[PDB]
PDB file of C-alpha atoms and ligand atoms in Angstrom:
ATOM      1  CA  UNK A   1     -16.159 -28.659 -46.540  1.00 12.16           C
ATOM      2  CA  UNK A   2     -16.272 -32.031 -44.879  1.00 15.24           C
ATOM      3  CA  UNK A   3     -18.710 -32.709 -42.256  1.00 15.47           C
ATOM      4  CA  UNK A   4     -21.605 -35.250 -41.569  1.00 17.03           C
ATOM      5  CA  UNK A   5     -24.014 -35.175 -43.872  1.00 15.96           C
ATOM      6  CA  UNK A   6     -24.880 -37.151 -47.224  1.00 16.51           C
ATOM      7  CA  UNK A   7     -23.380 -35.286 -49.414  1.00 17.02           C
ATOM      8  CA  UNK A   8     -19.860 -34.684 -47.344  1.00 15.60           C
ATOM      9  CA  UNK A   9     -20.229 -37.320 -44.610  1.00 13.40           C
ATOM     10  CA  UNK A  10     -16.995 -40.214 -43.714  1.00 13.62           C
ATOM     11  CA  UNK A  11     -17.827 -41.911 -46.572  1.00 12.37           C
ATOM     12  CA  UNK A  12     -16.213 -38.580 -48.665  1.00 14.03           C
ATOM     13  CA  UNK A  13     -13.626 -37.750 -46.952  1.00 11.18           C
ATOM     14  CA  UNK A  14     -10.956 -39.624 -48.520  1.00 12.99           C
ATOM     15  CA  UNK A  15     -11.304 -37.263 -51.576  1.00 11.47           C
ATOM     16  CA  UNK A  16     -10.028 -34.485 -49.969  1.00  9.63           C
ATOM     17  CA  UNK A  17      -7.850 -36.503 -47.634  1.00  9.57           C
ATOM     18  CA  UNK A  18      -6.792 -39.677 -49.055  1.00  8.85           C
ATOM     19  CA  UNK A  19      -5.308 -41.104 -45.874  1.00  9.24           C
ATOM     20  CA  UNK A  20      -8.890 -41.721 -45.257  1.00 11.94           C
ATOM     21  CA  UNK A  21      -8.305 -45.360 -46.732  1.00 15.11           C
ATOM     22  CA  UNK A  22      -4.642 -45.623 -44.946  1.00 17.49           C
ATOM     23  CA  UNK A  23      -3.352 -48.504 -42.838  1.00 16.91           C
ATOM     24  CA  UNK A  24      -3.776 -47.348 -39.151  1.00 18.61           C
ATOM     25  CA  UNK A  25      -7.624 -45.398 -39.251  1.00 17.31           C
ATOM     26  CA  UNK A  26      -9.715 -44.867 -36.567  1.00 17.88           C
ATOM     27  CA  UNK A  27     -12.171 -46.008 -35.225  1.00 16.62           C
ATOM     28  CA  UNK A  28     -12.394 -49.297 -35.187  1.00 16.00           C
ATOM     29  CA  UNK A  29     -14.768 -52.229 -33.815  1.00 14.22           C
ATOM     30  CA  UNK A  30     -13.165 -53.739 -30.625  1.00 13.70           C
ATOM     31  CA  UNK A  31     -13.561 -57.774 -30.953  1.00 12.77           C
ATOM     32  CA  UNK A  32     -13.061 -58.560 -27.334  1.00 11.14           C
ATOM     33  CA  UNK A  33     -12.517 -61.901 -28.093  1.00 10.19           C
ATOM     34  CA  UNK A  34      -9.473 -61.643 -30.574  1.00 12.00           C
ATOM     35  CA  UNK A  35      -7.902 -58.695 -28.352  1.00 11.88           C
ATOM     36  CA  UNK A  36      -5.021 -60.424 -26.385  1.00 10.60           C
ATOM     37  CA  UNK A  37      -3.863 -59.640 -22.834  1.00  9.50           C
ATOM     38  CA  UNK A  38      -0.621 -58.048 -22.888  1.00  9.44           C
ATOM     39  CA  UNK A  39       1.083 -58.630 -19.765  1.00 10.55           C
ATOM     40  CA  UNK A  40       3.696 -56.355 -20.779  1.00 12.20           C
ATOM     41  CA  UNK A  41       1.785 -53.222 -20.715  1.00 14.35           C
ATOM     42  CA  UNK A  42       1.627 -51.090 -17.339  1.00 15.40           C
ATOM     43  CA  UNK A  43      -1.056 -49.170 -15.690  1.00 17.10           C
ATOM     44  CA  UNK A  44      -2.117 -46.066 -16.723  1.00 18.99           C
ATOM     45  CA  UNK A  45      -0.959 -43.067 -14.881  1.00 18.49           C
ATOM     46  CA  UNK A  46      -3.562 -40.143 -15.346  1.00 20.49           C
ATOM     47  CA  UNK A  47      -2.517 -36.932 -13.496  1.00 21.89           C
ATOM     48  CA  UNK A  48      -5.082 -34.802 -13.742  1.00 19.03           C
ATOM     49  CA  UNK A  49      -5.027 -32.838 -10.265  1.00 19.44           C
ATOM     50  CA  UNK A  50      -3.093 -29.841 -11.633  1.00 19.45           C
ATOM     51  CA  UNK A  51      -5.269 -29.582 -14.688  1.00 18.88           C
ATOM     52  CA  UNK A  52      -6.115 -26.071 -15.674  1.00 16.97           C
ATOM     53  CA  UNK A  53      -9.137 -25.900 -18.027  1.00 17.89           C
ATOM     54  CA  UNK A  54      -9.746 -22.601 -19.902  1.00 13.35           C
ATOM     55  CA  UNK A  55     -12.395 -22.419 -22.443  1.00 16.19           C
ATOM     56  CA  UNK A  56     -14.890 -24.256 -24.448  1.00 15.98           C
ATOM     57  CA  UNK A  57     -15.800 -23.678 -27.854  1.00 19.46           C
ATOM     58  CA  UNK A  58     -17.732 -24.715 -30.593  1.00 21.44           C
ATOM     59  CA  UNK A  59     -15.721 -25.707 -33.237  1.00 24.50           C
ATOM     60  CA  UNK A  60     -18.749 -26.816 -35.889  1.00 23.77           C
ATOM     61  CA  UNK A  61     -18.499 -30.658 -35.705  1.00 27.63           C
ATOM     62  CA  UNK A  62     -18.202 -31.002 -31.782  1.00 28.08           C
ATOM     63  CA  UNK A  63     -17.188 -28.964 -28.862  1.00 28.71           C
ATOM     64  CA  UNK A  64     -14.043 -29.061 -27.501  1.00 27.56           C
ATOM     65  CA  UNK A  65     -12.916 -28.169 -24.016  1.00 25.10           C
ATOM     66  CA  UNK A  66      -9.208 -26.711 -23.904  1.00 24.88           C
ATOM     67  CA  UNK A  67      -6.201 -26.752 -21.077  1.00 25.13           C
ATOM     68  CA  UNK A  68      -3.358 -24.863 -20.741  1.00 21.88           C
ATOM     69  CA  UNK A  69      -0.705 -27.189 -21.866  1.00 21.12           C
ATOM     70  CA  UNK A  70       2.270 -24.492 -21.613  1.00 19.57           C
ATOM     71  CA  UNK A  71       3.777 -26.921 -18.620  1.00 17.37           C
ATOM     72  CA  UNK A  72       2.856 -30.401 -17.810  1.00 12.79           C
ATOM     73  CA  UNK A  73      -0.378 -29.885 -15.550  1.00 11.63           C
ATOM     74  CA  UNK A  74      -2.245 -32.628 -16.707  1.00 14.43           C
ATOM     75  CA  UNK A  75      -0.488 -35.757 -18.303  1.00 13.39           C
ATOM     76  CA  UNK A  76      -0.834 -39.022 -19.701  1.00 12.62           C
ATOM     77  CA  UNK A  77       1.876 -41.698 -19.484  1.00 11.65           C
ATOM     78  CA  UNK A  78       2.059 -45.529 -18.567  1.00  8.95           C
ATOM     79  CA  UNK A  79       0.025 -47.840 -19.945  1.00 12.06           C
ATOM     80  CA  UNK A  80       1.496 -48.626 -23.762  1.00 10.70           C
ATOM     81  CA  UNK A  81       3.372 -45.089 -23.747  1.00  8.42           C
ATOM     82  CA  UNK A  82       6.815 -44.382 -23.933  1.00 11.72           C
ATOM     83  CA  UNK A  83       7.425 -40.574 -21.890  1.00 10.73           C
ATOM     84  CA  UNK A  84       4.969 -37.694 -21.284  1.00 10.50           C
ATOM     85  CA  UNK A  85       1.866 -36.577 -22.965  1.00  9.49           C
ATOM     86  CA  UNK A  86      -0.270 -33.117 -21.998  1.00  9.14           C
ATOM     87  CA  UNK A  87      -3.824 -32.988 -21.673  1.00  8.74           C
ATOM     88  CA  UNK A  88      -5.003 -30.239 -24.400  1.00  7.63           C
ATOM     89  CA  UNK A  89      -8.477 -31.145 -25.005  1.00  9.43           C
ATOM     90  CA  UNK A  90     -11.159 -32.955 -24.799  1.00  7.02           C
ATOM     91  CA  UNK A  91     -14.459 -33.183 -26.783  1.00  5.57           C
ATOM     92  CA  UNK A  92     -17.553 -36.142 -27.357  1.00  6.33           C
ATOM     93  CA  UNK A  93     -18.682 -37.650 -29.838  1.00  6.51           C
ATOM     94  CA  UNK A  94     -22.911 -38.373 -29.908  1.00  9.94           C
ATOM     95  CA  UNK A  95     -25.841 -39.664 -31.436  1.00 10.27           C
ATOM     96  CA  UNK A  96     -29.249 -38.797 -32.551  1.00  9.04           C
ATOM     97  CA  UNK A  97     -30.439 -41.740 -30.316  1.00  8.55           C
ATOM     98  CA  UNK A  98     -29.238 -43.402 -27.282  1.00  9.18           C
ATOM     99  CA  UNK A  99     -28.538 -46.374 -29.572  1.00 10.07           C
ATOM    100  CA  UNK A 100     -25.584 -44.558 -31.652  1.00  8.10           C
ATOM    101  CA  UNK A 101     -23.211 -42.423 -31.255  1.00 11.35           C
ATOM    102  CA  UNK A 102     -19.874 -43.587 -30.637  1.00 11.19           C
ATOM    103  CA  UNK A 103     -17.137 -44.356 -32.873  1.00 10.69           C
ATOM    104  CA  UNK A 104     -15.027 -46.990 -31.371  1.00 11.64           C
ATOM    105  CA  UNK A 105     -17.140 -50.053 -30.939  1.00 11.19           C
ATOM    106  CA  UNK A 106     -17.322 -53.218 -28.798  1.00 11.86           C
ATOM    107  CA  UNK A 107     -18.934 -55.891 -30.354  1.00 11.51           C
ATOM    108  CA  UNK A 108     -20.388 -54.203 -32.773  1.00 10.28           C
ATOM    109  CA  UNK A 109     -22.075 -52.644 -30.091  1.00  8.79           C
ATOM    110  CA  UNK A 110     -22.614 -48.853 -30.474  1.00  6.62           C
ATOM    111  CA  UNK A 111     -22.369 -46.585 -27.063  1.00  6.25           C
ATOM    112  CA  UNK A 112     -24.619 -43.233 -27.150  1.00  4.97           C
ATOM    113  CA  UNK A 113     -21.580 -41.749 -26.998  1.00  5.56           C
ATOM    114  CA  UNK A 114     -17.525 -41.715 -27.141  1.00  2.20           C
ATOM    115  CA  UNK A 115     -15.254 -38.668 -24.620  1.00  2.58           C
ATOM    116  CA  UNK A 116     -11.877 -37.983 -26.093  1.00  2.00           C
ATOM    117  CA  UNK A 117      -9.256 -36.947 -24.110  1.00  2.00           C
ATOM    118  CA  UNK A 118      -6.488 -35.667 -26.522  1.00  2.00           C
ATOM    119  CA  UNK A 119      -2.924 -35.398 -25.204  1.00  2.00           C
ATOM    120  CA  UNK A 120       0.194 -34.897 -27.390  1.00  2.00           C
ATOM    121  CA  UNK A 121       3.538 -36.250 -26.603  1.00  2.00           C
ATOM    122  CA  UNK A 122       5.851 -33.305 -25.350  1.00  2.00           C
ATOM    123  CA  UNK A 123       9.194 -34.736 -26.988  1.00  2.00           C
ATOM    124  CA  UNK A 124       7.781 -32.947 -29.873  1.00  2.00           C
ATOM    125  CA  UNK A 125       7.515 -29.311 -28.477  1.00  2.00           C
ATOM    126  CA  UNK A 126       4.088 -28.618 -29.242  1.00  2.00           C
ATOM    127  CA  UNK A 127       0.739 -30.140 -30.578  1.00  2.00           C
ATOM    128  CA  UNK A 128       1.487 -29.106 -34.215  1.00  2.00           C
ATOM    129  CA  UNK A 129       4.601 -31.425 -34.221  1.00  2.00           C
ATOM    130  CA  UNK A 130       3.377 -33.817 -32.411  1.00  2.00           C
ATOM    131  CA  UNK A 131       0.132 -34.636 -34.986  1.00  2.00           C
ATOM    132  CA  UNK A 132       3.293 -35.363 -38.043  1.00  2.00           C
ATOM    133  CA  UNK A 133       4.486 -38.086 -35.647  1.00  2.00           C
ATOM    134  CA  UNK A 134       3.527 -41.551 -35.258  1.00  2.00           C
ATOM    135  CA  UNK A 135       3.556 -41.337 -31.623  1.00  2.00           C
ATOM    136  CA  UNK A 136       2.593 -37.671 -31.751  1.00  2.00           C
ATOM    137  CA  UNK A 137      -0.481 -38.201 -29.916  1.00  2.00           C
ATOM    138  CA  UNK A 138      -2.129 -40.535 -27.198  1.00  2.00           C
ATOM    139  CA  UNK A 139      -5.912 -40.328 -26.742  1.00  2.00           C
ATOM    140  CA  UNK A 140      -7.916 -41.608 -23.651  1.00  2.00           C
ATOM    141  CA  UNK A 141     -11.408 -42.850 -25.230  1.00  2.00           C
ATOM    142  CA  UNK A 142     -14.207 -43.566 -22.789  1.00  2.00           C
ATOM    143  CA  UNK A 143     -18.162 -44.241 -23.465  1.00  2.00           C
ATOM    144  CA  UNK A 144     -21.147 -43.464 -22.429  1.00  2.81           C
ATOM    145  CA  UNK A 145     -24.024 -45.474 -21.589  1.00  2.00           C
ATOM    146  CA  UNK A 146     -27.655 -43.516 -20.717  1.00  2.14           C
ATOM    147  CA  UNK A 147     -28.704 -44.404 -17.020  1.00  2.33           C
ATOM    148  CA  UNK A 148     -27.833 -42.289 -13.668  1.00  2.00           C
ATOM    149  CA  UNK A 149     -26.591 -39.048 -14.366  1.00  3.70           C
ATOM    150  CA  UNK A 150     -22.501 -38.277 -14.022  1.00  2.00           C
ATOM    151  CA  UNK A 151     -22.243 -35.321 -11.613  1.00  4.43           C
ATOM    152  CA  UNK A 152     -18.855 -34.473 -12.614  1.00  4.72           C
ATOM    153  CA  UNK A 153     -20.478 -33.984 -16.763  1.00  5.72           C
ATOM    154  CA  UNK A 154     -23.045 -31.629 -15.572  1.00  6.74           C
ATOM    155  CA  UNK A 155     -21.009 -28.356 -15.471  1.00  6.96           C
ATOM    156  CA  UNK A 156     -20.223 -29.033 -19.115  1.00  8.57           C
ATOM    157  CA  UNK A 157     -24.268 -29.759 -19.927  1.00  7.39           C
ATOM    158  CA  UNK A 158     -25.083 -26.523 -18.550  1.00  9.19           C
ATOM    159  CA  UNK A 159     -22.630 -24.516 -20.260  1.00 10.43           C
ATOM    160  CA  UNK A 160     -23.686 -25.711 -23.920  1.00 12.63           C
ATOM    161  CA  UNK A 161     -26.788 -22.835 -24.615  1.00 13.83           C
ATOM    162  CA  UNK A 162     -24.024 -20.404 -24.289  1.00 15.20           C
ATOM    163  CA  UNK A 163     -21.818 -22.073 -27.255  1.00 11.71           C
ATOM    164  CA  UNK A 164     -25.098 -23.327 -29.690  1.00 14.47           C
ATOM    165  CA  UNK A 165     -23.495 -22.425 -32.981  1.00 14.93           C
ATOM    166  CA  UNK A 166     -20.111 -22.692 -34.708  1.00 15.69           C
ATOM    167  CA  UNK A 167     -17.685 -20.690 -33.426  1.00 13.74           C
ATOM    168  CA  UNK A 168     -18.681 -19.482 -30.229  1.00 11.56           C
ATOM    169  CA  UNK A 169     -16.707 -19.966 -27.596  1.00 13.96           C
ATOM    170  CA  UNK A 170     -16.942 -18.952 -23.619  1.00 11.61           C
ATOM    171  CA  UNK A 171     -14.808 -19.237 -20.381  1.00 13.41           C
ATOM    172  CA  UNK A 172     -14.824 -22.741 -18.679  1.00 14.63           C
ATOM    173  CA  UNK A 173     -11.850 -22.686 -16.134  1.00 12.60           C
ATOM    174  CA  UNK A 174     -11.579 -24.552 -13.140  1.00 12.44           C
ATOM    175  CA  UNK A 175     -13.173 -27.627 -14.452  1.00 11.61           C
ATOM    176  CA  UNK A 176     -11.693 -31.147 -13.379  1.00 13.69           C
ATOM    177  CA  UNK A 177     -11.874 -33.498 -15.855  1.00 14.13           C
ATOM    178  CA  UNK A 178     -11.423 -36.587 -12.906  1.00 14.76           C
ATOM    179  CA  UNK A 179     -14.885 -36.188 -12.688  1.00 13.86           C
ATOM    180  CA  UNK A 180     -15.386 -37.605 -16.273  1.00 14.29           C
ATOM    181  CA  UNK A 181     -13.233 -41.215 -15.305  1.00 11.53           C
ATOM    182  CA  UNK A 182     -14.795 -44.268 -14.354  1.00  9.82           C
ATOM    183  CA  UNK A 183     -13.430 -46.604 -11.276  1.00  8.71           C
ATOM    184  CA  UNK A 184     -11.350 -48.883 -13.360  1.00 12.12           C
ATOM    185  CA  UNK A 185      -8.632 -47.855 -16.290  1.00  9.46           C
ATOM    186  CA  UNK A 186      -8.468 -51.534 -17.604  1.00 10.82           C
ATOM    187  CA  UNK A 187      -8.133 -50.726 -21.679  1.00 12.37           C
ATOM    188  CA  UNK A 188      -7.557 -51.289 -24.683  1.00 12.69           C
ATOM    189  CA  UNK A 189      -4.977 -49.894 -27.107  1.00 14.11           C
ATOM    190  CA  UNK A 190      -3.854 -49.880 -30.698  1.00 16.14           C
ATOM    191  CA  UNK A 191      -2.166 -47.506 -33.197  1.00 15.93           C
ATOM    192  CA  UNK A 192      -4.358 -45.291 -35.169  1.00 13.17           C
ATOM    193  CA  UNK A 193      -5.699 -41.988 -36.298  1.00 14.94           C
ATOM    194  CA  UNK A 194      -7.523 -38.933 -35.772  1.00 13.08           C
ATOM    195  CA  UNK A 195     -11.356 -39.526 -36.583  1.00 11.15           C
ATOM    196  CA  UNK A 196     -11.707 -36.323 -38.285  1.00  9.42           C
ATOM    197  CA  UNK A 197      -9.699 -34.277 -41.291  1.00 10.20           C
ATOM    198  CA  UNK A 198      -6.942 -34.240 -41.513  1.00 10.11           C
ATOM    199  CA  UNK A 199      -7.251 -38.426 -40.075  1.00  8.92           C
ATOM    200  CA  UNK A 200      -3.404 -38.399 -39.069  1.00  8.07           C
ATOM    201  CA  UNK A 201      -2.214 -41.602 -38.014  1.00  8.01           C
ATOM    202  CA  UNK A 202      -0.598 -40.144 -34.814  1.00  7.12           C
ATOM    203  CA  UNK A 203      -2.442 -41.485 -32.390  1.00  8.34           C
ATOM    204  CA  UNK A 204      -2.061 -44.207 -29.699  1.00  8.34           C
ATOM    205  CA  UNK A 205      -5.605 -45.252 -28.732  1.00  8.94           C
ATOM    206  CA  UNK A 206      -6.277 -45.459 -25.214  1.00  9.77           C
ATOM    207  CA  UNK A 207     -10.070 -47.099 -24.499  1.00 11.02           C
ATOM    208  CA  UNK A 208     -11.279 -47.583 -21.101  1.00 10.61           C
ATOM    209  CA  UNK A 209     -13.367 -50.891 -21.109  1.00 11.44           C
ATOM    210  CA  UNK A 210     -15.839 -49.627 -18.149  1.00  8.54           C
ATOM    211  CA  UNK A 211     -18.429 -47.513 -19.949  1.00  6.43           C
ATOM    212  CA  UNK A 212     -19.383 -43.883 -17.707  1.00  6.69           C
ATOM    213  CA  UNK A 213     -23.298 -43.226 -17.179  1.00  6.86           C
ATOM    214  CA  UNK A 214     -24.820 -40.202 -18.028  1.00  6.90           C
ATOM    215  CA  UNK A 215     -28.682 -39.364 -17.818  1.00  3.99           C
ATOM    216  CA  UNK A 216     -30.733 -39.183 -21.037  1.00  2.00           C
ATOM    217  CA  UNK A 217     -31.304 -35.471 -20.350  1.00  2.00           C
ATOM    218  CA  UNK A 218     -27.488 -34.831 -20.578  1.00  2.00           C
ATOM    219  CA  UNK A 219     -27.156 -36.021 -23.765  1.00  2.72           C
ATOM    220  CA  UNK A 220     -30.087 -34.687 -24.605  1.00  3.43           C
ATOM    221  CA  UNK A 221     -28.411 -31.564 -23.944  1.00  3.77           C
ATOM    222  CA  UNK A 222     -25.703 -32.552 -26.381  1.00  5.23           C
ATOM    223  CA  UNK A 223     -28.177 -32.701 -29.197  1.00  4.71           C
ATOM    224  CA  UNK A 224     -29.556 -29.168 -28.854  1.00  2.60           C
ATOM    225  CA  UNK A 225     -26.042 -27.765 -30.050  1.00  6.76           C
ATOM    226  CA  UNK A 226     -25.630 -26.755 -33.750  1.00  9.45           C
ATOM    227  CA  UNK A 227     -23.438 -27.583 -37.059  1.00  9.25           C
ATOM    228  CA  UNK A 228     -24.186 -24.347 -38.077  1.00  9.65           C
ATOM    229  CA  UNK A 229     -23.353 -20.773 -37.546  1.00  8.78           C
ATOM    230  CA  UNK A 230     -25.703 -18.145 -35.814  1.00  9.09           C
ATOM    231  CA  UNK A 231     -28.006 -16.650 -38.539  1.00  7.26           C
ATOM    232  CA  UNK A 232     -27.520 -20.007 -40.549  1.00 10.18           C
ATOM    233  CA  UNK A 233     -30.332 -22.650 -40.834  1.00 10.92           C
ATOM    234  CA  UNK A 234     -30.459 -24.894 -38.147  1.00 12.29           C
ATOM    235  CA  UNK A 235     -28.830 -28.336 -38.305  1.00 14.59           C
ATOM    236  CA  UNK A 236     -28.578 -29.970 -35.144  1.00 14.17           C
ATOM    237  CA  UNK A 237     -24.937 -31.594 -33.928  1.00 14.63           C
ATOM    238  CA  UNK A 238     -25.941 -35.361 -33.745  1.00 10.82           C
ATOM    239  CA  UNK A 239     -24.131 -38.249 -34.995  1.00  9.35           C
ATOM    240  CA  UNK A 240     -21.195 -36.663 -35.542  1.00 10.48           C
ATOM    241  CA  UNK A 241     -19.311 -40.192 -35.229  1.00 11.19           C
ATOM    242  CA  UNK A 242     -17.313 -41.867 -37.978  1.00 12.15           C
ATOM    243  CA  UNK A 243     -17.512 -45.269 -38.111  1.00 14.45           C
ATOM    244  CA  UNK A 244     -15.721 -48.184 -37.581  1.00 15.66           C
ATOM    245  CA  UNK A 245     -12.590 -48.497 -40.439  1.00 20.86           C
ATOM    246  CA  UNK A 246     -10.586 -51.810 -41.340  1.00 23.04           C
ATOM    247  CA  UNK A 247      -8.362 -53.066 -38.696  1.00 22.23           C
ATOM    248  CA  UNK A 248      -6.007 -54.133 -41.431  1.00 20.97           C
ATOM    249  CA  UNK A 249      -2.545 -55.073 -40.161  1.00 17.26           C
ATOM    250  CA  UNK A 250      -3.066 -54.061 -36.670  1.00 17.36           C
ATOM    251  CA  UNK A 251      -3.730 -55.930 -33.025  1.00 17.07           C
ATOM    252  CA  UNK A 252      -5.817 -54.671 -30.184  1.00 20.29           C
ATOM    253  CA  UNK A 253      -3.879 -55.316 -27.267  1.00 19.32           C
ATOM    254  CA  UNK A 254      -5.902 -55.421 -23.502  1.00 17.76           C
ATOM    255  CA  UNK A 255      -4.110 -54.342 -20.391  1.00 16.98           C
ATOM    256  CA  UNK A 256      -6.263 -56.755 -18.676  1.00 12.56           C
ATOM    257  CA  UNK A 257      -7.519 -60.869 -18.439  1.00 13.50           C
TER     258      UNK A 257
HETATM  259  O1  Q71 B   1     -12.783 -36.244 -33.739  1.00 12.21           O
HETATM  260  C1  Q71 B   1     -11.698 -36.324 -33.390  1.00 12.21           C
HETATM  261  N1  Q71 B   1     -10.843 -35.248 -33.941  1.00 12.21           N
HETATM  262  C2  Q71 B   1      -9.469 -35.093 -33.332  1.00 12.21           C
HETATM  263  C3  Q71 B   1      -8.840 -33.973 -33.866  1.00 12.21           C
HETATM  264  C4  Q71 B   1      -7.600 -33.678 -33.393  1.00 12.21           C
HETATM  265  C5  Q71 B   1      -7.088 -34.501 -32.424  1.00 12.21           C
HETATM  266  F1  Q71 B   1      -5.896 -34.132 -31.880  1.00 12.21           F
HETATM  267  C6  Q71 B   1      -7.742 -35.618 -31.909  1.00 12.21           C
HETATM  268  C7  Q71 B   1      -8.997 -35.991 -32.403  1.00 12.21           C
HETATM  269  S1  Q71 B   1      -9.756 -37.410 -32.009  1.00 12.21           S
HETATM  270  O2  Q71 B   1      -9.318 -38.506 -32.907  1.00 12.21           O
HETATM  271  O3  Q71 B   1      -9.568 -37.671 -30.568  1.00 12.21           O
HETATM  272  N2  Q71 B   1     -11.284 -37.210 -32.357  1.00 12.21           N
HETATM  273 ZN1   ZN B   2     -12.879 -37.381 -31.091  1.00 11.34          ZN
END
């Protein structure tokens, strides 16, 4: 089964799922340079007060926070979207070192570590439809730089012994996922895919230019959890980022000069 190791890492994926080498993957490096303003594009509109978070689980290559998305509580729309998308999850991507661990990249520069906030475009009924879709999906991508801790990240942190190993899962309601955003929602955005199997090209990336802090110990935190199952041999859940992919025939738009 895919995953991130050497033997069935991103660089084997497309064997399994040949899209891997398609025109619209994700990540991608963001050349800040090239990426022109788009004065047509609008604000984002994050709505997040109404969000209802219910669990957390370990899925075995991150771990994923989930909503209710059975009525629109918490929605994306604005910015380069066309109608409504629902909050279902979000998750992180992270490194073995502060120096890696994102997947979108600025620069070339790597962030310790990339949130994903995963919302699917209700026109299509339900999350399942939405991933066939070219515009089935729109996700929010922010990093994370290592300085001062982010208070709103440290309900998550302490959560994360209870959820170690693949599988596990555990209650996590009344968690507000404001807390994650920085002050500005100046972005970038361009059409692309899923960074895991099955690497859909659904998705409308969304990624906030202003970086979050968190503290080394939180993402130190991150690094405890495991890749494996309880009762299997240990593998810790680091770099579990894919990296960047050919921008190919596609433009990086900013919503900002
Ligand atoms: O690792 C990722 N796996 C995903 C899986 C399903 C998604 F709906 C969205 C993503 S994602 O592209 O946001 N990141
Ligand atoms: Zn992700």
């Amino acid at each position: 089964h895919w995953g991130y190791g050497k033997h069935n890492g991103p660089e084997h994926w497309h064997k399994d799922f040949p899209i891997a080498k398609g025109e619209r993957q994700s990540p991608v490096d963001i050349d800040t340079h090239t990426a022109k303003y788009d004065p047509s594009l609008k604000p984002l509109s994050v709505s997040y007060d109404q969000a209802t978070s219910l669990r957390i689980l370990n899925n075995g290559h991150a771990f994923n926070v989930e909503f209710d998305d059975s009525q629109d509580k918490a929605v994306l729309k604005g910015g380069p979207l066309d109608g409504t998308y629902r909050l279902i999850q979000f998750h992180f991507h992270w490194g073995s070192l502060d120096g890696q661990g994102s997947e979108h990249t600025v620069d070339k520069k790597k962030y310790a570590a990339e949130l994903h906030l995963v919302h699917w475009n209700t026109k299509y009924g339900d999350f399942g439809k939405a991933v066939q879709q070219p515009d089935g999906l729109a996700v929010l991508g922010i990093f994370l730089k290592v300085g001062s801790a982010k208070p709103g990240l440290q309900k998550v942190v302490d959560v994360l012994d209870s959820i170690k190993t693949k599988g596990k899962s555990a209650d996590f309601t009344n968690f507000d996922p404001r807390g994650l955003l920085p002050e500005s929602l100046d972005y970038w955005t361009y059409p692309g895919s899923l960074t895991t199997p099955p690497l859909l090209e659904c998705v409308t990336w969304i990624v906030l230019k202003e970086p979050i802090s968190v503290s080394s110990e939180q993402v130190l935190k991150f690094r405890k959890l495991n890749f494996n199952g309880e009762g299997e041999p240990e593998e810790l859940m680091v770099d579990n980022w894919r990296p960047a992919q050919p921008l190919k025939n596609r433009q990086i738009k900013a919503s900002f000069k």
